[PDB]
Amino acid sequence: SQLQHNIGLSIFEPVAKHRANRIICTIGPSTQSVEALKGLMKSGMSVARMNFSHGSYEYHQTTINNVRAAAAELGLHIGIALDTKGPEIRTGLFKDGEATYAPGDTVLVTTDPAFEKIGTKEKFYVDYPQLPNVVRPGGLIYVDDGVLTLRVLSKEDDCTLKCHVNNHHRLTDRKGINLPGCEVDLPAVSEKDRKDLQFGVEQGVDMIFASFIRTADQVREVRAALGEKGKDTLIISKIENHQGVQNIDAIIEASDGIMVARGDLGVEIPAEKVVVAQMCIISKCNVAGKPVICATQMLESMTTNPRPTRAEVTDVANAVFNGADCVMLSGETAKGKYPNEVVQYMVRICIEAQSATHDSVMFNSIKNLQKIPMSPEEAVCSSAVSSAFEVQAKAILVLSNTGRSARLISKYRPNCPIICATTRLLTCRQLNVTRSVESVYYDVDAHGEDNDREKRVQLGVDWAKTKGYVSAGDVMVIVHADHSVKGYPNQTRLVRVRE
Amino acid sequence: SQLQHNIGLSIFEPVAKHRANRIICTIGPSTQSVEALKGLMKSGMSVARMNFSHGSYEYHQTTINNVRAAAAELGLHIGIALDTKGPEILPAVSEKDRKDLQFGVEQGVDMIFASFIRTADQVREVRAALGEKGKDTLIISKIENHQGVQNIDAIIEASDGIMVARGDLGVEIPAEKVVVAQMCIISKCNVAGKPVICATQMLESMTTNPRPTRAEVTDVANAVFNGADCVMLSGETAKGKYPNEVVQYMVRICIEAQSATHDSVMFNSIKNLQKIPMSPEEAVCSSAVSSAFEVQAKAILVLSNTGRSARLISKYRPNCPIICATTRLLTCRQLNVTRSVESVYYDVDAHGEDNDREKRVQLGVDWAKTKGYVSAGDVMVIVHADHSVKGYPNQTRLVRVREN
Amino acid sequence: SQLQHNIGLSIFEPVAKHRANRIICTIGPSTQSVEALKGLMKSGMSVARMNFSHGSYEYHQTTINNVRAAAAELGLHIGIALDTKGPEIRTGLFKDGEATYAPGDTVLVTTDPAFEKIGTKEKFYVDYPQLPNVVRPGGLIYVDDGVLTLRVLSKEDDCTLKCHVNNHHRLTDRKGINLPGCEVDLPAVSEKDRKDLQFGVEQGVDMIFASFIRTADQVREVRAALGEKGKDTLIISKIENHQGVQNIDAIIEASDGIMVARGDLGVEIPAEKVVVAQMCIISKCNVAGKPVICATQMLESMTTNPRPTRAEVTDVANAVFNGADCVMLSGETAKGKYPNEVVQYMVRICIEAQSATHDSVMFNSIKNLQKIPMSPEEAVCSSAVSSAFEVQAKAILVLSNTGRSARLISKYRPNCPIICATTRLLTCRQLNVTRSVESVYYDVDAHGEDNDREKRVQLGVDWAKTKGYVSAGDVMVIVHADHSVKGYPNQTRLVRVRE
Amino acid sequence: QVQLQESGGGLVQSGGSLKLSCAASGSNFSSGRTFSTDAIGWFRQAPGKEREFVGGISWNGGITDYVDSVKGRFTISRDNAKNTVYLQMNSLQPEDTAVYYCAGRDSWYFSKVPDEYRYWGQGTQVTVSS
């Protein structure tokens, strides 16, 4: 029980856990150089997030090139992720970067591209061209996360409106518009979104963070847009409004993973609720054995200060305790004065929470929900984690070429590293968002074919021995596919490391 | 299992649970008025904290009289706590502390928040300072540095309660460590069956803004999940611009976390940690809570005079409110710091001695009826002592409430 | 839970279990014919018992040769057991087959090797030679099974004793006598025992039912008595006196299996306790993973009637519920009017009681006795049984050359058949005495070397297909050794039968 | 993972004073620990002996401890911005002659037990002649 565990914790004993959780880092001005990326990889990064709501294909090509380079230098396999800009009534490019609005003021809200950047305290641009036809005089316009509300007074012109400012606010370039009445009927993928996705498939990204996903049909649209040239890239649905919470079950089934965008959620739902919502979404994800990621608002203040607030640290630790596979930084590492240090703090938080969690509880919980009879595949992975606990194995080594098996093992949440020996680099890259997992590449072309699965097993055990997981006389658990399975691993082996 | 509970939570269902966690409020300029005190009380406060690091004896005498008055008007038993100054910027009881502690004892405070507690010897020095006139007042030891965490077990046996000053802890030890220390200390207290409170850095930004940050909110929720009996406000209610809204915010968070926690995990954990010949006291208490679960009782009425029983039933964390029918008013006030308890007072002088133990029971059932907990047809667990036993509860009755 | 199982039982539903307990038949006048034996085998015999208490090497040679011929005809592997006569006082032989005594008579008991076949109401022979020197006047000499008591009155010659009969009981022939008096200095293996053991070894028996086992050192003496030629033969210690129960822990450790002789036991200890001793012994054997057999007093009334009594049936049923591996028939099959019929009843009782047992209780109870960190060997076997339960496997197929693994899997008591593919016919025959196992033989010489361990797996799957156990679509659990180590199986796969 | 680099030993007069310095590079990337996360101890090994606790300082400097022999004479402080630990030694006496090490523990809190430290400086000779 957690209780017994908790009463046994000591602040004074060093911790000893090999970090299970994974860290996603957004790239931008502070971290786009190759030396920066190398320090980010050394100091814990598993996925590099390219945030397409800003920047040109040139800026993002630089990131892709630079990360592949730093990785190579380091001999790692780093995931690259594309975060879509997404359907969003947006507005920005303010003349001098900014405009301040006082209550009682009147302001022009235009859909003319001539003011698209010359947006002043009197006239600014809103990206939706149907706004004059959808908002009538009287209703409001929520600008910058419901912080700055405007009351429509008149349809001043064909594509401009004269509005009444409720509360003072400092509006910076490109802040989201959140029209309270719906019937906006927003799509799954803007025309920019689509183009960007082809750029991504064309450059070889490993996962899409699709933004503002509300229904399952839209995840399907994202898939369609990725095409067959990228039928294998992960789609990670970004849950950021109440619709996505509402349809979380359909969405989870149509996605490869989930991202809980807490600060976006926070504009429509109260904070005490957002807490609950995170517990439900992460746990559903756990049960589905899909990756789930906590994003918005993590060590926010560490963008400018050398240390976060305790409140923020507990916030991260909660995400871990709650079940999250990954934590993502967004601007802590993009524009921040302490990129590496914040990554290393995330590493310390992850290990502390991991050491602070009863190792068996999740295994037992997940196992009790499993309907019986289990499939063979399910049973193989379940009982591999169970055998691990029972013999006190120090590593599970799964040979998988797609990564399915390693994800199913990680769902059962063992208390040891999972090592995946794969023949595909894309699988190394994509496994970076699955808890406990580390991959190991067997270039078949440059070696045998390993039909007897033996040099791949050696590759795995060699990795575990050199990375401190396992020693002479330790037991390990080998999960792989037999000679005779259409697909999937169905064999397991309990081996002892030999001197 | 918590996992199964989580996967069926919904952000859209109104939540229906009676708040089991207790809020402590610090009093200052924004809240010393009797009207303002009444507002705190209506908006969920159960104990008033006096910070003896600032303010004169006259100033706190003012707060004591004002809380007693506003409480009297609302018909509530609010506790009063005296937060010691401590040897601040080494001994345990500063001379100032001694005079402050006797002032509190003479003026009838319910508990001491002993500052900078490092060894169990120091909490016993505090108990000595309290004297016989304060023999029965709660000593709540404030853990605010590494010796406090190192010696937490001795400090827990010697104290009545423990308070985690997480901001104070964060000066010597790193934040991730404070996270772990909080879980350790809360649960050590949970097992010990003694109240534990979380103190600093709570909704601090609400001191000046009308809503806090989401990180702050999960920090409070995470205290509740961690097992804490009470949360404490500090500047939020003393200097703050929104004292009433922040207490209400604490109430909403407490309820949501409570409804998100799995009802049986605590009970099963605490019970399985017990040794196999249980003592009859412990047995009656656990089995009452157990019986409450098995029969889905909506209330547990316990007849304690000292409140011992109420603390023990609380340790097993039942699903429903615990109504304590007591005859000592100081117990009404001290019980505001234990989770899920709500005291009803029976004046033994003004009403005939309830030798039968039967009018107190009725009093309790009527309280539960009006509050809204129990309705005709519902079951309740009644726990008291028999005509002849040695000063502790030993019998338990199961009652179906009837139209009356 | 058994309660929950019990209240769901129906007497009108046909049972559909595969018989897991095993039946040992002793061979005698009604069954020694090759045709009789084939009928016992078809009827469900797994081991043929030879009571070496009676019979010549020519007779037992004949039994041996006939059972091999009958098995060869039916394509079976039947185990042969040799039950020792043991260090047990015997009562010569009596002329005209019988002789009766009345209390108040005087009868001579001589040890003069003469009169061994004469044997009259007036003077008879006994096995012990120093009987005149040990039992002194007044001593109580109990014959048959304590049924008769005699009091030693006279000294007579160096060879003979005059005793007062305190009875009313008719003797049958070459009965045993168990005299309570001490200074008996009981041997472990008599000269007759030793030569009988060699005959068995030289003729190739599969197992010894060692008689009257009291201490562990006796079991070692028996082992010694079998030379290098007999190191592979199982010794099953027959527990038949109070000392047997006294030392059961040492004797279990030293033996390959235990036989609970309840009649023999009932002569020295009260029935009520025999019941308890049976529970104790059987369960300790289950936890040790060694076979235990219940032997005397089984369906004794069926030697001459075509129906057993209900209490007799429940006695058998109780042994199975208790945890017994095998039940053993004695006179019922040796000198009885209904040999095939009583074996078929044993088959029916086994199936009924196995089907009324709760599938999972024994697996759980044994698994919770296990100290945690389990050995890999133990982990592999227990985990294969839990896998079988979770996937609702219809068969476990283990590839074991000595059978150690098959016994370890059986110890965890799965609910489906266990098929053991061996390269050793001695193993096929010796596994006949463990619950739920069935052997399939791979002739290394006839076919390949099955280095891959593939032909054998096919042999096993094929078998379970023809046997009626599995159909295309069902799941099977396969346990074997990898091709990098030897000694014990450490590898497991879950396979769906295809056809 | 983290490496320590000592400087500052020598010869000094009875009653004089020296300043030992230890500079830190590197990280235990596995754990996310750096000099600024780790408590630091100072130990000394006098000729022929084992190696004894002198003083210790927690990660952020908020806690220090000293053996009685050096209390009032020695001062441990640290500058996390410069990745450096200092051991200031005043009123040095012949009994302080020894080789002196800094060591780093993977804990925010220090120990007096040498085996509980994870990385060491390579040691410097301090000789007090009167």
Side-chain angles (χ1 to χ4, degrees), chain C residues 176-182 184-185:
Chain C
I177 284 118
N178 64 34
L179 79 80
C182 318
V184 175
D185 275 18

mmCIF file of all heavy atoms in Angstrom, chain C residues 173-185, unseen atoms left out:
data_model
loop_
_atom_site.group_PDB
_atom_site.id
_atom_site.type_symbol
_atom_site.label_atom_id
_atom_site.label_comp_id
_atom_site.label_asym_id
_atom_site.label_seq_id
_atom_site.Cartn_x
_atom_site.Cartn_y
_atom_site.Cartn_z
ATOM 1 N N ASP C 173 -4.168 -67.272 5.362
ATOM 2 C CA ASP C 173 -2.855 -67.938 5.174
ATOM 3 C C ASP C 173 -1.756 -66.884 5.059
ATOM 4 O O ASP C 173 -2.071 -65.733 4.715
ATOM 5 C CB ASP C 173 -2.862 -68.871 3.961
ATOM 6 N N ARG C 174 -0.516 -67.279 5.334
ATOM 7 C CA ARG C 174 0.628 -66.361 5.252
ATOM 8 C C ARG C 174 0.346 -64.913 5.629
ATOM 9 O O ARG C 174 0.826 -63.980 4.990
ATOM 10 C CB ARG C 174 1.330 -66.453 3.888
ATOM 11 N N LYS C 175 -0.412 -64.759 6.726
ATOM 12 C CA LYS C 175 -0.722 -63.442 7.254
ATOM 13 C C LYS C 175 0.521 -62.894 7.952
ATOM 14 O O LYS C 175 1.561 -63.559 8.065
ATOM 15 C CB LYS C 175 -1.923 -63.484 8.202
ATOM 16 C CG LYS C 175 -3.229 -63.335 7.472
ATOM 17 C CD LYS C 175 -3.234 -62.117 6.592
ATOM 18 N N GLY C 176 0.453 -61.616 8.330
ATOM 19 C CA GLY C 176 1.603 -60.921 8.884
ATOM 20 C C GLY C 176 1.452 -60.837 10.412
ATOM 21 O O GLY C 176 0.342 -60.853 10.861
ATOM 22 N N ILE C 177 2.469 -60.780 11.285
ATOM 23 C CA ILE C 177 2.165 -60.427 12.694
ATOM 24 C C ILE C 177 3.039 -59.228 13.159
ATOM 25 O O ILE C 177 4.247 -59.071 12.828
ATOM 26 C CB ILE C 177 2.429 -61.653 13.627
ATOM 27 C CG1 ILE C 177 1.625 -62.971 13.885
ATOM 28 C CG2 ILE C 177 2.608 -61.178 14.916
ATOM 29 C CD1 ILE C 177 2.372 -64.231 13.507
ATOM 30 N N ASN C 178 2.272 -58.309 13.784
ATOM 31 C CA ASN C 178 2.825 -57.030 14.286
ATOM 32 C C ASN C 178 2.714 -57.056 15.805
ATOM 33 O O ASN C 178 1.689 -56.592 16.332
ATOM 34 C CB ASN C 178 2.039 -55.862 13.693
ATOM 35 C CG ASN C 178 0.591 -55.863 14.142
ATOM 36 O OD1 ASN C 178 0.285 -56.252 15.268
ATOM 37 N ND2 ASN C 178 -0.307 -55.440 13.268
ATOM 38 N N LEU C 179 3.714 -57.589 16.469
ATOM 39 C CA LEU C 179 3.829 -57.752 17.916
ATOM 40 C C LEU C 179 4.268 -56.434 18.550
ATOM 41 O O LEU C 179 5.237 -55.821 18.084
ATOM 42 C CB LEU C 179 4.783 -58.896 18.263
ATOM 43 C CG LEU C 179 6.312 -58.805 18.250
ATOM 44 C CD1 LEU C 179 6.855 -58.154 19.504
ATOM 45 C CD2 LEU C 179 6.923 -60.179 18.062
ATOM 46 N N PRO C 180 3.522 -55.929 19.537
ATOM 47 C CA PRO C 180 3.842 -54.610 20.100
ATOM 48 C C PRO C 180 5.153 -54.588 20.853
ATOM 49 O O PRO C 180 5.787 -53.528 20.936
ATOM 50 C CB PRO C 180 2.661 -54.351 21.042
ATOM 51 C CG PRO C 180 2.300 -55.694 21.525
ATOM 52 C CD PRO C 180 2.622 -56.683 20.418
ATOM 53 N N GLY C 181 5.553 -55.715 21.433
ATOM 54 C CA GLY C 181 6.771 -55.776 22.205
ATOM 55 C C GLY C 181 7.943 -55.214 21.431
ATOM 56 O O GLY C 181 7.976 -55.256 20.194
ATOM 57 N N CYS C 182 8.905 -54.655 22.155
ATOM 58 C CA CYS C 182 10.007 -53.950 21.517
ATOM 59 C C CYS C 182 11.122 -54.961 21.767
ATOM 60 O O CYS C 182 10.858 -56.033 22.330
ATOM 61 C CB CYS C 182 10.538 -52.870 22.462
ATOM 62 S SG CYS C 182 9.211 -51.967 23.322
ATOM 63 N N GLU C 183 12.364 -54.611 21.388
ATOM 64 C CA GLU C 183 13.542 -55.406 21.019
ATOM 65 C C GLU C 183 13.287 -56.184 19.730
ATOM 66 O O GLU C 183 13.647 -57.362 19.621
ATOM 67 C CB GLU C 183 13.922 -56.367 22.152
ATOM 68 N N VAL C 184 12.760 -55.495 18.716
ATOM 69 C CA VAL C 184 12.430 -56.126 17.443
ATOM 70 C C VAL C 184 13.580 -55.888 16.470
ATOM 71 O O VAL C 184 13.874 -56.754 15.636
ATOM 72 C CB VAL C 184 11.085 -55.603 16.873
ATOM 73 C CG1 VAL C 184 10.817 -56.182 15.483
ATOM 74 C CG2 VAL C 184 9.910 -55.906 17.806
ATOM 75 N N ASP C 185 14.294 -54.766 16.630
ATOM 76 C CA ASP C 185 15.436 -54.402 15.780
ATOM 77 C C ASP C 185 15.073 -54.589 14.302
ATOM 78 O O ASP C 185 15.691 -55.367 13.565
ATOM 79 C CB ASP C 185 16.676 -55.230 16.154
ATOM 80 C CG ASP C 185 17.483 -54.629 17.308
ATOM 81 O OD1 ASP C 185 16.948 -53.773 18.048
ATOM 82 O OD2 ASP C 185 18.658 -55.034 17.480
#
